[PDB]
Amino acid sequence: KLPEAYAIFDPLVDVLPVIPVLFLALAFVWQAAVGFR
Amino acid sequence: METLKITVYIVVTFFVLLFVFGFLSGDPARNPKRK
Amino acid sequence: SANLWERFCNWVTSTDNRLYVGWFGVIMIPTLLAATICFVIAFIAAPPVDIDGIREPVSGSLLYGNNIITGAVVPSSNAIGLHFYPIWEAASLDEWLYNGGPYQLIIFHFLLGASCYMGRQWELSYRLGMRPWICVAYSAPLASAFAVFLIYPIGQGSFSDGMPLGISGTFNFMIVFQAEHNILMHPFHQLGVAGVFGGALFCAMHGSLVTSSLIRETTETESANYGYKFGQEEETYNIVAAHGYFGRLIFQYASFNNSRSLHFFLAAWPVVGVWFTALGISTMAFNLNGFNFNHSVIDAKGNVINTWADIINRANLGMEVMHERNAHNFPLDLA
Amino acid sequence: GWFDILDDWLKRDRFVFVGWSGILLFPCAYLALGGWLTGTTFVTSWYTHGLASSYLEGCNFLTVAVSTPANSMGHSLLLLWGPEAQGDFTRWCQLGGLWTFIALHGAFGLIGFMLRQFEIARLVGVRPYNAIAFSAPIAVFVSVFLIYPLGQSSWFFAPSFGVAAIFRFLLFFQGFHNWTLNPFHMMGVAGVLGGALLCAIHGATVENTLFQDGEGASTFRAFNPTQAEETYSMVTANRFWSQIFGIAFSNKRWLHFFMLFVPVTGLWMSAIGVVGLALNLRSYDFISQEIRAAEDPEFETFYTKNLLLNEGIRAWMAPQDQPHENFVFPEEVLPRGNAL
Amino acid sequence: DQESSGFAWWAGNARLINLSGKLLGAHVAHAGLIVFWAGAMTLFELAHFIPEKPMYEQGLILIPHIATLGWGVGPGGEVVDTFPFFVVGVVHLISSAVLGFGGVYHAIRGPETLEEYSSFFGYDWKDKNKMTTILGFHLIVLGIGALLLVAKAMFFGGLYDTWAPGGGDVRVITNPTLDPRVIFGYLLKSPFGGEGWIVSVNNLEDVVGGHIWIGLICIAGGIWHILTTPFGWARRAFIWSGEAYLSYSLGALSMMGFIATCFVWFNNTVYPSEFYGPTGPEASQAQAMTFLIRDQKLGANVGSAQGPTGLGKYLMRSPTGEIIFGGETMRFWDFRGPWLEPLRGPNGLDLNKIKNDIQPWQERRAAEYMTHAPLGSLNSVGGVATEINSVNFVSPRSWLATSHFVLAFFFLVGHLWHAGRARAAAAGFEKGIDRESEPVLSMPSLD
Amino acid sequence: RIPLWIVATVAGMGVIVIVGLFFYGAYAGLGSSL
Amino acid sequence: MTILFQLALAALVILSFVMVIGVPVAYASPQDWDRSKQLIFLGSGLWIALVLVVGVLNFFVV
Amino acid sequence: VSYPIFTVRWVAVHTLAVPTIFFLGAIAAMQFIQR
Amino acid sequence: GTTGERPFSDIITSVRYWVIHSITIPALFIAGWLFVSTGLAYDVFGTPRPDSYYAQEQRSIPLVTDRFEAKQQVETFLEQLK
Ligand code: CLA
Ligand code: CLA
Ligand code: CLA
Ligand SMILES: C=Cc1c(C)c2cc3nc(c4c5[nH]c(cc6nc(cc1[nH]2)C(C)=C6CC)c(C)c5C(=O)[C@@H]4C(=O)OC)[C@@H](CCC(=O)OC/C=C(\C)CCC[C@H](C)CCC[C@H](C)CCCC(C)C)[C@@H]3C
Ligand SMILES: CC1=C(/C=C/C(C)=C/C=C/C(C)=C/C=C/C=C(C)/C=C/C=C(C)/C=C/C2=C(C)CCCC2(C)C)C(C)(C)CCC1
Ligand SMILES: CC1=C(/C=C/C(C)=C/C=C/C(C)=C/C=C/C=C(C)/C=C/C=C(C)/C=C/C2=C(C)CCCC2(C)C)C(C)(C)CCC1
Ligand SMILES: CC1=C(/C=C/C(C)=C/C=C/C(C)=C/C=C/C=C(C)/C=C/C=C(C)/C=C/C2=C(C)CCCC2(C)C)C(C)(C)CCC1
Ligand SMILES: [Ca+2]
Ligand SMILES: [Fe+2]
Incomplete structure (x- = not known):
């Protein structure tokens, strides 16, 4: 039930919920680059 | 059986009181040296 | 004087009382004595208790046909459910006993004291100026005792379910739990086992290694133990000779060398792991059970190929079926 | 004369030590972990038992295994070149050769690894309370994967090297041996379970009794890997516990030996117990209870309750779990409660 | 920051205990992940949601909330119009960009201390008052929020009503339960079988009245705090530390976390069961x-x-x-x-x-x-553990109650962790016993 | 030459993929229930 | 109408993506924090307009 | 320093590394075997 | 203590390393992928292909029933499989 027009975003809309996890994972890439000061 | 209910509450209240006050009695204070 | 209360609060808080009664202890002390005393009597003498809902009374006490291994304090009745059944709510002790009143009295009290016991395990540390967290390591067992005695029942709807106070009825709780939740197949239990199994494994390691590097300070005809003196100045074994070996057993960096970093890994591994099982029982309390792979690996035509997951389930059914033989009237076990 | 030239080579402080013991420890160890990983993803348990035991078949990490050989095999070693396999590697895979292969190689692998603990210890000059401690696990594996089966009909009844393939071994025991009611297993538990408590109460006591030897909060650094004073205060600890549990240590040397005895001892008792179940010399029932319940139909204890669970576990499981027996239990025979 | 100067890498965020400016961006950025989620997931639900197939049979947990408020449902929870869902989902998804912009900004560009950048926003932990103030505001902010519900019920469309006289269907409450008796009653009602606790509440009149009875209390407090300071006992009772403030608020959540796990597992009213299982x-x-x-x-x-x-x-x-x-x-x-x-x-x-x-x-x-x-496995296979495959389903009621007990619990652990640390960081010895002056060493032995 | 924080994350996200391809295999695969 | 709308909404996507990689690198890179000051102001205003545009265009479609 | 290129450890690190990837590739291939 | 031989941190970071392995690793990955893909694996380990457990009927499992003549037994089992 995603209004037709937007239905060209299904694939994207399907992935959005996971993004937040990524942040915690990116925060680890950050410290890795900064050598865990 | 009712008397037993009364007793118990009286008894449970006595201790619940002691507990609440005892901490209110400035517990932080009790320790080697409160920096 | 100086108003006894002021004084009372100083004794209660005495940092040098054989046993540290604290503010938490002011509850732990009577609560645990009510539980412990009622348990001890219940276990020795006590009529059969109509555990399930029916009227098929089970006897757990000694004077009624049991031995230490079979005996137990039976869970309050199913007719009671989650309802609060204290002694004053009974028409007579006999009613209270036949319906399992002793159980509720004993668990509500043990859970209350065991909690304050956790709180007490902080108060003293504070009063002694030491770091806290010991009480947080003890939150694992407590959390497990909470799951099994309070959470699991709140989920299932009755204290009749929820591990019974007795050696054999503990095995009962398990053998049935399995059939109802296929727990062995739940991540949280496997982590529980890695924790409990792991914990032991490391307890042997730590205890092993250290003992293996004690500094020679005794003859051949006298305990190695005397080589240490209570409160003695410096360390009592070579933490470097220790790592010198363990490192070489596997490989240098696959080893410890920092007592602090090593000892923490000791208190974190089993605690984190045991927490989980508590979260498993607490989770499967709301019916999110273990993995289910029954009838997977189906072949080309549609024939079911059976994997070990099925021999499992096959043995689980056998449990599901025979348990509580006279308590079911309908097809599905939704309680 | 060259023995030494070799000894020298072997005992060289490399990344991964080797040793004479390694001339056994690695040939096997790898060769075993290897066979498991293989069988786990490629070989099947269809001719042996009657199930998919690998990845290639559709099984997942939990449901895979290198399942024991057919019962008709017996206690046969199943040597790739023996009467059975007749040299043919693939069939060897099908009759269950990969099991005795893993079992036996892993076996010598644990012998190897202990010799190692004994070789490295002699060199580095420390007491061997780690090869002694490791006897505990030898006992478990040597009695659960070797003695047990040798006592029964074939290898078919040994654990199978699989996650679920074990949970099955667990229930089977509860169902046919009524293990949980065995005093030896009980000790087993009391030890593994309390060995965990020691390994966690000690860890916490140390960490929350540390003196300050740093400025920051992450006190991990405050510990000089180099000698000197104890890092936490045994004196303060001994005090804590003694007032909050009545008893408390006060001899690091004894504390750490206890920590070795507890978990080790319990796995030993655990073993003796199984050595018993090999001869079905189990601790199944309490006769005093049976006689009573036979005569008086109103006597019920959590004991009897559990015994019915067993009847159920055997009745419904046996059939698919022991194929070579061609069991056929008509629906009217299957013991069942009401409704369910 | 650095370790040899601050804390330790895996303890990073404590390096911000005294850098409100950044500590604001931390809070803002995060408060964006929540909205982002609320939003991103509602569309994920909707994108899969099937107009006429039980919601509970579709793993929905957000849409069900929106429905209960009386949005796109109609009789028996008929899912009459999907838009309110799409609508709600996106608004959040956008407001996340806003909040997200603030966080990234306030924890990077912006000042890393509100000290002089603005003395009204700047704050002092031990300042046993600027706290009572900030608290006060928030206490009012929550109140406005509570009253919003009363609005959606008494003025804008009403809410869902399983108990609906005609039968499940949206209904505008217009008789909120006033009166302390009935309202506060639920407060001291045993949590045990039968007489439940707060989890009773079998009608929307009370749910609504109870909320009306909240702002007119919650805001009453939001003021009393912006207008005062902790009394005597208050001060000689709590530990006034940033970390300590956390702790109290940690246990708070945790405690509610259970109250919630119980609510979604037992109550039929504020969780229709037409939308949930x-x-x-x-x-x-x-x-x-x-x-x-x-x-x-x-x-x-x-x-x-x-x-x-x-x-x-x-x-x-x-x-x-x-x-x-x-x-x-x-x-x-x-x-x-x-x-x-x-x-x-x-x-x-x-x-x-x-x-x-x-x-x-x-x-x-x-x-x-x-x-x-409410029975199923982890891999979502509806039914008893011994059931065969097909019909994959797990009641929302399970998923919810399950997740929250975990969160709820760990937070209690968290509470102890910090309440215990901040309560010793104060007496000041959270880094080890003072070699030179071991309290124990000066106490009469017990033997 | 090649940074750690870049050898990691690459490999990291890498295994997250293979281990994810595995998790997909649960459904559809042979180990599926269809 | 949909052409307009789709491409409009599709703009709000790429622009947002760009903002995301930018603003951070922007705030983080003092190396011309005067140039991005402008750029960012573009993204921000523009983004909002885009949103408001798609909002109304939605109605002319659904 | 002048570290060697082929060491005993290299023999080890490869005996587990080579088979693994071979497997991870084989196992990743099964995910598409069906019916 | 004593820290000997070529270090990993370095080696992983070495451009030469990836030069060498950005050939070998995927090589192995595709090498094994074909092991399954080709169906070779099956034949190596006598493991049944989804269409080879029971011939159209025989709802009976092909269970090896005796050592010594064990193999001949398995063979005929595959035989029947038509
Ligand atoms: C309510 C919110 C909350 C807040 C604001 C804080 C805030 C703080 N905590 Mg506390 N904490 C909380 C809840 C909270 N905590 C809970 C519930 C627990 C119990 C588990 C803890 C346990 C805890 C510990 C043990 C420590 C802190 C510390 C700290 C301080 C430093 C932060 C840090 O080290 O980040 C760095 C964060 C990380 C290393 C990453 C998070 C890692 C977790 C384990 C992953 C969980 C992720 C996800 C759920 C699982 C992934 C999926 C899985 C299936 C694979 C900071 C003041 C530290 C301190 O210095 O104390 C003063 C410290 O040592 N906290
Ligand atoms: C998601 C929650 C979260 C949040 C909001 C914060 C926030 C913060 N952290 Mg913490 N942290 C977290 C999780 C979090 N952390 C975890 C899980 C860990 C354990 C690994 C740490 C470990 C940690 C350490 C070790 C340190 C901090 C520090 C800081 C502060 C300074 C930021 C900085 O130095 O950036 C550095 C800048 C960058 C390299 C840029 C990162 C990219 C940006 C921020 C993301 C852009 C987001 C998105 C993609 C774009 C949206 C754009 C759109 C709106 C247009 C800041 C208050 C520091 C501190 O305390 O300072 C004194 C510090 O030393 N943190
Ligand atoms: C957002 C939540 C909130 C918060 C965090 C605070 C916080 C605070 N309030 Mg405010 N308050 C609020 C809302 C809030 N209030 C509202 C809505 C009102 C109504 C207008 C008030 C009215 C109010 C008054 C009238 C007073 C305060 C005071 C205070 C301060 C100390 C008092 C105290 O905490 O005693 C803690 C409580 C005790 C020592 C008593 C324990 C015994 C009770 C009877 C048992 C509680 C048991 C509970 C029901 C069972 C669950 C327990 C659980 C552990 C299992 C403290 C800063 C005092 C102050 O200093 O003034 C500024 C004060 O006099 N508040
Ligand atoms: C729960 C399971 C459990 C496991 C998995 C386990 C594992 C291990 N313990 C070791 C050590 C120890 N364990 C000890 C006490 C204990 N260990 C316990 C329980 C376990 N210990 C318990 C309960 C105790 C008593 C407290 C001590 C005292 C030590 C050590 O000193 C030693 C160590 O170094 O500590 C870290 C390591 C020895 C390495 C080795 O032998 O290589 C050689 C052998 C190899 C590589 C071949 C594997 C052999 C087996 C027979 C084959 C299994 C087959 C497959 C490979 C795997 C099965 C698959 C499963 C799905 C079932 C190894 C990691
Ligand atoms: C048998 C045999 C043999 C040999 C062989 C071998 C030696 C092999 C090996 C093999 C190997 C050696 C293999 C391996 C494999 C592996 C794999 C397949 C792995 C995987 C993994 C994974 C999948 C992981 C994951 C994870 C985890 C666990 C946790 C953390 C996270 C992660 C996610 C990362 C011979 C000829 C003598 C003879 C006959 C028999
Ligand atoms: C400080 C810090 C941090 C953090 C961060 C954060 C917390 C962030 C956030 C962020 C955020 C929070 C963001 C957000 C964003 C958003 C966006 C960007 C959005 C967008 C949207 C849109 C675009 C919409 C629309 C639509 C529709 C309507 C439909 C169709 C589809 C779509 C989807 C298109 C870290 C850890 C890293 C590190 C350190 C520092
Ligand atoms: C697109 C889009 C959007 C937005 C977005 C966003 C807001 C994003 C974010 C994002 C993010 C935020 C991301 C992230 C990612 C990450 C990653 C991918 C990571 C990784 C990591 C790793 C792999 C790690 C590792 C490791 C290890 C294993 C070990 C230790 C060390 C280390 C840590 C290195 C929107 C809505 C508008 C719409 C359209 C589309
Ligand atoms: Ca889709
Ligand atoms: Fe120790």
């Missing part, structure tokens, strides 16, 4: 309903029917005498639900009604629920 007890009840009906509608005389133990298959009595459903279900004789009440009398389930007043809508509703009970 059926209550656990509800389903165990419906299996009896289902067979008391099937067998009656087949010759049986349920009132007299006696089962294997002598209790009567279909009907038996409760400890206080009420006539309830028989079987293990004797434990759930507390369940109250729309589909069942019409069969209830003054002494409990009435026979006459049962014998000939059971409309078909119940026979099938009862069937729906017993076949949608």
